[PDB]
Motif scaffolding. Structure first.
Motif, PDB file in Angstrom:
ATOM      1  N   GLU A 291       0.833  -1.194   0.000  1.00  0.00           N
ATOM      2  CA  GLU A 291       0.000   0.000   0.000  1.00  0.00           C
ATOM      3  C   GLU A 291       0.875   1.254   0.000  1.00  0.00           C
ATOM      4  N   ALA A 292       2.131   1.096   0.436  1.00  0.00           N
ATOM      5  CA  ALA A 292       3.142   2.140   0.373  1.00  0.00           C
ATOM      6  C   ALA A 292       4.474   1.514  -0.038  1.00  0.00           C
ATOM      7  N   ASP A 293       5.505   2.347  -0.219  1.00  0.00           N
ATOM      8  CA  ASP A 293       6.731   1.872  -0.839  1.00  0.00           C
ATOM      9  C   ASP A 293       7.928   2.004   0.102  1.00  0.00           C
ATOM     10  N   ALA A 294       8.043   3.149   0.789  1.00  0.00           N
ATOM     11  CA  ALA A 294       9.239   3.430   1.567  1.00  0.00           C
ATOM     12  C   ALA A 294       8.921   4.253   2.814  1.00  0.00           C
ATOM     13  N   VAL A 295       9.649   3.947   3.896  1.00  0.00           N
ATOM     14  CA  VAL A 295       9.653   4.723   5.127  1.00  0.00           C
ATOM     15  C   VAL A 295      11.054   4.627   5.731  1.00  0.00           C
ATOM     16  N   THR A 296      11.426   5.630   6.533  1.00  0.00           N
ATOM     17  CA  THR A 296      12.775   5.729   7.069  1.00  0.00           C
ATOM     18  C   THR A 296      12.746   5.573   8.591  1.00  0.00           C
ATOM     19  N   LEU A 297      13.433   4.532   9.076  1.00  0.00           N
ATOM     20  CA  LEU A 297      13.278   4.048  10.438  1.00  0.00           C
ATOM     21  C   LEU A 297      14.596   4.156  11.200  1.00  0.00           C
ATOM     22  N   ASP A 298      14.486   4.181  12.535  1.00  0.00           N
ATOM     23  CA  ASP A 298      15.612   3.962  13.427  1.00  0.00           C
ATOM     24  C   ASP A 298      15.904   2.464  13.473  1.00  0.00           C
ATOM     25  N   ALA A 299      17.018   2.099  14.119  1.00  0.00           N
ATOM     26  CA  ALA A 299      17.546   0.744  14.103  1.00  0.00           C
ATOM     27  C   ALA A 299      16.536  -0.262  14.650  1.00  0.00           C
ATOM     28  N   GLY A 300      15.874   0.094  15.759  1.00  0.00           N
ATOM     29  CA  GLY A 300      14.907  -0.774  16.415  1.00  0.00           C
ATOM     30  C   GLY A 300      13.789  -1.200  15.467  1.00  0.00           C
ATOM     31  N   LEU A 301      13.314  -0.244  14.660  1.00  0.00           N
ATOM     32  CA  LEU A 301      12.229  -0.467  13.718  1.00  0.00           C
ATOM     33  C   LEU A 301      12.740  -1.199  12.479  1.00  0.00           C
ATOM     34  N   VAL A 302      14.030  -1.022  12.160  1.00  0.00           N
ATOM     35  CA  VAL A 302      14.645  -1.708  11.033  1.00  0.00           C
ATOM     36  C   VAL A 302      14.562  -3.212  11.284  1.00  0.00           C
ATOM     37  N   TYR A 303      14.714  -3.599  12.557  1.00  0.00           N
ATOM     38  CA  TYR A 303      14.612  -4.986  12.977  1.00  0.00           C
ATOM     39  C   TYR A 303      13.158  -5.439  12.891  1.00  0.00           C
ATOM     40  N   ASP A 304      12.263  -4.670  13.523  1.00  0.00           N
ATOM     41  CA  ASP A 304      10.838  -4.961  13.526  1.00  0.00           C
ATOM     42  C   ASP A 304      10.342  -5.172  12.097  1.00  0.00           C
ATOM     43  N   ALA A 305      10.843  -4.344  11.172  1.00  0.00           N
ATOM     44  CA  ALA A 305      10.396  -4.335   9.788  1.00  0.00           C
ATOM     45  C   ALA A 305      10.776  -5.630   9.071  1.00  0.00           C
ATOM     46  N   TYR A 306      11.924  -6.215   9.436  1.00  0.00           N
ATOM     47  CA  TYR A 306      12.463  -7.350   8.700  1.00  0.00           C
ATOM     48  C   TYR A 306      11.751  -8.631   9.134  1.00  0.00           C
ATOM     49  N   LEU A 307      11.202  -8.616  10.355  1.00  0.00           N
ATOM     50  CA  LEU A 307      10.562  -9.781  10.944  1.00  0.00           C
ATOM     51  C   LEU A 307       9.324 -10.159  10.138  1.00  0.00           C
ATOM     52  N   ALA A 308       9.059 -11.470  10.073  1.00  0.00           N
ATOM     53  CA  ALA A 308       7.827 -12.000   9.510  1.00  0.00           C
ATOM     54  C   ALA A 308       6.643 -11.423  10.285  1.00  0.00           C
ATOM     55  N   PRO A 309       5.515 -11.074   9.621  1.00  0.00           N
ATOM     56  CA  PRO A 309       5.307 -11.363   8.199  1.00  0.00           C
ATOM     57  C   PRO A 309       5.678 -10.250   7.220  1.00  0.00           C
ATOM     58  N   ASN A 310       6.405  -9.243   7.718  1.00  0.00           N
ATOM     59  CA  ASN A 310       6.689  -8.039   6.953  1.00  0.00           C
ATOM     60  C   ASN A 310       7.849  -8.295   5.994  1.00  0.00           C
ATOM     61  N   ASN A 311       8.983  -8.743   6.548  1.00  0.00           N
ATOM     62  CA  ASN A 311      10.188  -9.023   5.784  1.00  0.00           C
ATOM     63  C   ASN A 311      10.509  -7.834   4.880  1.00  0.00           C
ATOM     64  N   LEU A 312      10.882  -6.712   5.505  1.00  0.00           N
ATOM     65  CA  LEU A 312      11.370  -5.541   4.793  1.00  0.00           C
ATOM     66  C   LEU A 312      12.894  -5.532   4.867  1.00  0.00           C
ATOM     67  N   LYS A 313      13.532  -4.757   3.982  1.00  0.00           N
ATOM     68  CA  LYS A 313      14.985  -4.709   3.928  1.00  0.00           C
ATOM     69  C   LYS A 313      15.460  -3.264   3.786  1.00  0.00           C
TER      70      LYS A 313
END
Ligand code: AU
Ligand code: AU
Ligand code: AU
Ligand code: AU
Ligand code: AU
Ligand code: AU
Ligand code: AU
Ligand code: AU
Ligand code: AU
Length: 676
Positions: free
Chosen positions: A53-75
């Protein structure tokens, strides 16, 4: 061609909107455009990008981890930097600053006095306490209570001082403002300077911000995780964690990561640092740190081989993994946990499996697709150990793995107590052509063992790279014999092999191999790249072949780096590089275990066992060189030579580094991103 940016507030949404408009004006039709999706939080933006529904957001380190976790799997895809283009500083370093006047290690922190920037701060609390989690006495819940029971006293700003008083033995009341003198970065430091506490958990930069003169900074040191100390200057090799400051994440698959870069790059040019005062990308008319940290001085593209676990780093993911999972072991803290060996072929996996069962469960096995995959597993803790060639020992080193054990090939009585340091790559040339120096090799005719071989190709051409006339490697030598090159190139023009084997890397070449490149030396050739004992084993009548019968050592000199020439047996002082043995690589934190387990294992199944059909042995393969090279007799402990730089020759490093400029490694480029 539009990127849907995700804002987490109204103020942000506005900035995004004028970011859309301003980028709508400057950029032509065939240019990137900004869209402005708006959600309620960072978690929502994350799920939105995942839901496509969106493409990009800019996160701190803590959220970078949260983002990569299933079911999101962001990089991570694009990073903010905070300095110049030569000094990017896309990361910060959580350090542990101490007086030089004290003597104790990281593992001796129990009972000391600590100074924290604030409870909940990553650098000043989460990271340290995350790493120290298992060292805290039970119960670990609540955390504040546990940390109180670990340090004799502390200043933890913003702690439940009324419930956990000790956490403020150093700063009474737990003041969570700048009224508490021991609060924040400068405060946590003053907590140390004043000698109230023994250690300050802060950023690498904190010390530089509070002491201008190098004189005073020298009164301070850093606690490294390996239980050593280092000066304040070398935080880069003595930090608690390396943390990405602010990072842009997209979908791991179908993320449009190229569009985000195409956009963000063209944005930072038109509206970057000190660019257009019409619209600042790193300044908010409607608040501060909208979309991007105002600190930022631009963007960098994250190399595509980077997953989130790699980008945050082992230490960082361990810290937060402990804080969340909170699962410590209960096995004797003395005994080594099993060592997970990494296999990269079916046959490698099979051999490993057999090893594991006879190892009485002290060796385990992990499969990965490629060598670069296995190395990644070592890095992030999915695997523990593996044996690498010099080329890979280098890449592993750039990624921050350490050589611990060298493969020994020579039968030595006490080989377990002596590394080999390998053979010597020499450039040999006849004393006949007598005006030949290292410099005037340009346009000479050459003789290589084979392209991609260490002594034959890698080292010589690696060092000739500085003047290699571009990645075109056939342009340097007018002609030569480099078995393996394209059958139409100048380096195949001297290879005397009839028919299909005209420039093929095999025996039927005749000008292939160490002994071959030497026949190439005599039979139409100026220079030849071989090992130190190639000359003595082919001359003196050691070789009864037609051409070799009557050659003598006195005829062939070795070319040196300094330009000089030398006799053959003077190889020790007239060599190109020190072509090394294969070496077991691992994480620094498992250095101790790998050493022991592997020493015990090579006792049971080492080169010292015959009857290998009824009993398992480690240095024999079903096919060829599985897990270890079959020539291995033992695994030498690498006292002193236990960094990649110190295991490989300074020259070997220079050479391999040069060659890697023409043959990119997506892993290497990712690792060099974190450690430039
Ligand atoms: Au504009
Ligand atoms: Au942020
Ligand atoms: Au720094
Ligand atoms: Au512009
Ligand atoms: Au600035
Ligand atoms: Au180039
Ligand atoms: Au050891
Ligand atoms: Au042994
Ligand atoms: Au040692």
């Amino acid at each position: 061609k539009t990127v849907r940016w995700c804002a987490v507030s109204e103020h942000e949404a506005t900035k995004c909107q004028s970011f859309r408009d301003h980028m709508k004006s400057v950029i032509p039709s065939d240019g990137p455009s900004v869209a402005c999706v708006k959600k309620a939080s960072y978690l929502d933006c994350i799920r939105a990008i995942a839901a496509n529904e969106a493409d990009a957001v800019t996160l701190d380190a803590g959220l970078v981890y949260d983002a990569y976790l299933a079911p999101n799997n962001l990089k991570p895809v694009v990073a903010e930097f905070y300095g110049s283009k030569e000094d990017p500083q896309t990361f910060y370093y959580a350090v542990a600053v101490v007086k030089k006047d004290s003597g104790f290690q990281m593992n001796q922190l129990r009972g000391k006095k600590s100074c924290h920037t604030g409870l909940g701060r990553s650098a000043g609390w989460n990271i340290p306490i995350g790493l120290l989690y298992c060292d805290l006495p039970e119960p670990r819940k609540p955390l504040e209570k546990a940390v109180a029971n670990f340090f004799s006293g502390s200043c933890a700003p913003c702690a439940d001082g009324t419930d956990f008083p000790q956490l403020c033995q150093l700063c009474p009341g737990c003041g969570c403002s700048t009224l508490n003198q021991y609060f924040g970065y400068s405060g946590a430091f003053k907590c140390l300077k004043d000698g109230a506490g023994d250690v300050a958990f802060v950023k690498h930069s904190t010390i530089f911000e509070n002491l201008a003169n190098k004189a005073d900074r020298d009164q301070y040191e850093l606690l490294c995780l390996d239980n050593t100390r280092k000066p304040v200057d070398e935080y880069k090799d003595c930090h608690l964690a390396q943390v990405p400051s602010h990072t842009v994440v997209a979908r791991s698959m179908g993320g449009k990561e190229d569009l985000i870069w195409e956009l963000l790059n063209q944005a930072q040019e038109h509206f970057g640092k000190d660019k257009s005062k019409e619209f600042q990308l790193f300044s908010s008319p409607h608040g501060k740190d909208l979309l991007f940290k105002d600190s930022a001085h631009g963007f960098l593209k994250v190399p595509p081989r980077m997953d989130a676990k790699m980008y945050l780093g082992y230490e960082y993911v361990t810290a937060i993994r402990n804080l969340r999972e909170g699962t410590c072991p209960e096995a004797p803290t003395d005994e080594c946990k099993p060592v997970k060996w990494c296999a990269l072929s079916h046959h490698e996996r099979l051999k490993c499996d057999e090893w594991s069962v006879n190892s009485v469960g002290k060796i385990e096995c992990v499969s990965a697709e490629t060598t670069e995959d296995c190395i990644a597993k070592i890095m992030n803790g999915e695997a523990d150990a593996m044996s690498l060639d010099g080329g890979f020992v280098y890449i592993a080193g750039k990624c921050g793995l350490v050589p611990v054990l060298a493969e020994n090939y020579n039968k030595s009585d006490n080989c377990e107590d002596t590394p080999e340091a390998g053979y010597f790559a020499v450039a040999v040339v006849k004393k006949s052509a007598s005006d030949l120096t290292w410099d005037n090799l340009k346009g000479k005719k050459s003789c290589h063992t084979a392209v991609g071989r260490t002594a034959g190709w890698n080292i010589p051409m690696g060092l000739l790279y500085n003047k290699i006339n571009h990645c075109r490697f056939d342009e340097f030598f007018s002609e030569g014999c480099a078995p393996g090159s394209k059958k139409d190139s100048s380096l195949c023009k001297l290879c005397m092999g009839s028919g299909l084997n005209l420039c093929e890397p095999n025996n039927k070449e005749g000008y292939y191999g160490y002994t071959g490149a030497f026949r190439c030396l005599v039979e139409k050739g100026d220079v030849a790249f071989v090992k130190h004992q190639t000359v003595p084993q082919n001359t003196g009548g050691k070789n009864p072949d037609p051409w070799a019968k009557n050659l003598n050592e006195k005829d062939y000199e070795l070319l040196c780096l300094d330009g000089t020439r030398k006799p053959v047996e003077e190889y020790a002082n007239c060599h190109l590089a020190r072509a090394p043995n294969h070496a077991v690589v691992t994480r620094k934190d498992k250095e101790a275990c790998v050493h022991k387990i592997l020493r015990q294992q090579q006792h049971l199944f080492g080169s010292n066992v015959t009857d290998c059909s009824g009993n398992f042995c480690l240095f024999r393969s079903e096919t060829k060189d599985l897990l270890f090279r079959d020539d291995t007799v033992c695994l030498a402990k690498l006292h002193d030579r236990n960094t990649y730089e110190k295991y490989l020759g300074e020259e070997y490093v220079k050479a391999v580094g040069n060659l890697r400029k023409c043959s990119t490694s997506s892993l290497l480029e990712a690792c060099t991103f974190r450690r430039p």
